[PDB]
Amino acid sequence: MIYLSRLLIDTGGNPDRPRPGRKWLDNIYNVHRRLSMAFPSGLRREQDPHFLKPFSPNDFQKTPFLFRVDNNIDGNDKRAIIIVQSVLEPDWDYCFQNALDFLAAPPETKEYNPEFKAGQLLRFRLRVNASVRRHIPEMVQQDGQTIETGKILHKRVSLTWDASSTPDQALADWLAAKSPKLGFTLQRCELLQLGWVYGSKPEPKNVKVKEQGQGYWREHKYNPLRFRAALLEGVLEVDDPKLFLKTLSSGIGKAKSFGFGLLS
């Protein structure tokens, strides 16, 4: 059930006027938030059509889904493309119903269903994290005299590849070896984009107390999160049209919420 579509956003052209979409694209936590309060619910849909209510994420349906932000030229106009697909029907008449400045052209819903059988030459790109659990999380190197104090911490650090090669034949080897698990293969792979992606997620806490109830009085906190990016393509030959559909429903890698998803 592919629901591939597009959300063409309004990049500005004057960094003097306020630019809502450009600022919104700089934080992937809020990018996921924006993409996730779409298709909200039918629970309180009959109450209000105006999106004027105190926000709570519990009312929104907790179905995991996917997106990816990219850039393309159609024939004559640069416009950043967001490609989404989900198991629920598209209803972007409420997510952007008072934030029309976020959009450039009204979004379009397509219908698509896959068929590849085995060994064709009609495949597409991919996005993934270069995340590996560390072999040697060496004992928490602390500061003060550039020393080492701690014991251990299993962390999902960035992939430390080799030092005598480039990653268009190192990460290429990596997903070429990864492909027979997920039910496909790579005969050619050249990377297009790599780097880091950043965000910020807020943590509600509780320190203070209230004299007539429980501790409503409390403070704020923010925390950062980082990921290693890899956008790349390939001419691929699917092993079987019976297990690759699960990979087309989950994606190579499972950042999902934070951009890196399935093959497109």
């Binding site: 500005g12 052209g13 004057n14 960094p15 003097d16």
Partner: protein, 371 residues
């Protein structure tokens, strides 16, 4: 015999004129947005150009009495004399724009160094000599408002009016299509290594690219009246204006963009009443898949030029027109008729035709009247 210049010039992505906010200057014409190269910027760009060297000399001055020593320590008494002439002092300069301009600073030097005179008569003769400088043809193309400040002296400044009724009219440069603003992103990239990714500064710059239609409106009679005769000097300044309009661009942010795009077509006319073909581009130029926008804009211009030439007729006022393209790369008579009287391929005989229609002069003897 009005000198009207209609030009077509396509520009590479650049930012020539900007405001205090860094945006390229834009204006509205026909309900749609156009790129604007402001009139004062064109006047200064042609003024500060390389070819406007033999006829320059309308020097801007706000810090006065410092060049007087350059031509004794006249910072005290000459500035005191200038204050007594109305140009008051607020700092280590004069807080009044003075258009003294002409190269007769020898007269000011010799009256200032004359330590045998008082203040009132010296300030008076200064008032007649700076109101009658009348050299520096940029004065004849842009006038003055030097009328001192009457809050000084013993009120004995019976000066003469300095206004010159300058003969130049320059329209703001108009793009023939929809202006498309663009955003440039730059980083500073800290040279020594650090513990961060490294970017010493982050900024956003703008630029644009457009096909420009320009309008310079000068009349010959006020130009030669403001220049007390000297017909060859008038030919020199109109030739300098033609060469500078054809060869120079505003030098704003050109170290990072380099848009030295020379000309596509030129409309130089001579008539008795002024007209602007900006109304040709009231309809914006839309790109067709078969032709480029310079050819399209020249076609639209030719359509409206034929309109005005035929639909506004008086038998006692014949009007001619000159058309120029580099090696006839874009002839104006594509549609129906040979609109211009003569289609010219190189700039030099275009200037020669300008000289021939103005006074029959040549391009060799015209440089003798340096003045």
């Amino acid at each position: 015999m009005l000198i009207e210049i209609h030009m077509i010039q396509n520009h590479s992505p650049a930012n020539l004129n900007r405001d205090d906010l860094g945006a390229p200057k834009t204006c509205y014409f026909g309900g749609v947005l156009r790129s604007r190269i402001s009139s004062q910027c064109i006047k200064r760009s042609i003024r500060t150009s390389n070819d406007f060297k033999a006829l320059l000399g309308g020097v801007r001055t706000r810090r006065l009495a410092d060049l007087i020593q350059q031509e004794t320590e006249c910072w005290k008494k000459a500035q005191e004399i200038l204050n007594k002439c109305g140009f008051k002092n607020k700092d280590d300069n004069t807080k009044m724009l003075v258009f003294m301009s002409k190269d007769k600073i020898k007269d000011l030097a010799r009256i200032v160094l004359d330590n045998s005179l008082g203040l009132t008569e010296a300030a008076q003769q200064v008032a007649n000599v700076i109101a009658q400088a009348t050299l520096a043809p940029d004065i004849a193309l842009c006038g003055r408002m030097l009328e001192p400040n009457d809050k000084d002296k013993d009120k004995k400044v019976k000066w003469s009016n300095t206004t010159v009724e300058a003969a130049l009219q320059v329209a703001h440069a108009i793009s023939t299509h929809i202006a498309r603003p663009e955003i440039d992103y730059f980083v500073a990239a800290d040279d020594v290594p650090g513990e961060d990714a490294g970017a010493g500064h982050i900024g956003e710059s703008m630029f644009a690219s457009a096909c420009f239609y320009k309008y310079f409106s000068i009349d010959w009679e006020q130009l030669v009246k403001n220049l007390k005769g000297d017909t060859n000097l008038a030919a020199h300044t109109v030739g300098a204006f033609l060469l500078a309009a054809a060869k120079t661009n505003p030098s704003g942010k050109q170290n990072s963009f380099a848009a030295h795009n020379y000309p596509d077509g030129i409309l130089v006319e001579f008539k008795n009443s002024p007209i602007s073909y900006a109304n040709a581009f009231v309809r914006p130029v839309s790109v067709v898949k078969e032709s480029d926008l310079v050819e399209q804009s020249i076609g639209q211009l030719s359509n409206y030029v034929n309109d005005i030439r035929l639909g506004y007729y008086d038998e006692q006022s014949p009007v001619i027109g000159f058309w120029f393209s580099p090696n006839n790369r874009y002839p104006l008579g594509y549609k129906h008729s040979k609109l211009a009287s003569r289609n010219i391929g190189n700039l030099n005989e275009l200037v020669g035709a300008v000289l021939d229609y103005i006074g029959g002069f040549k391009w060799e003897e015209v440089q003798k009247s340096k003045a």
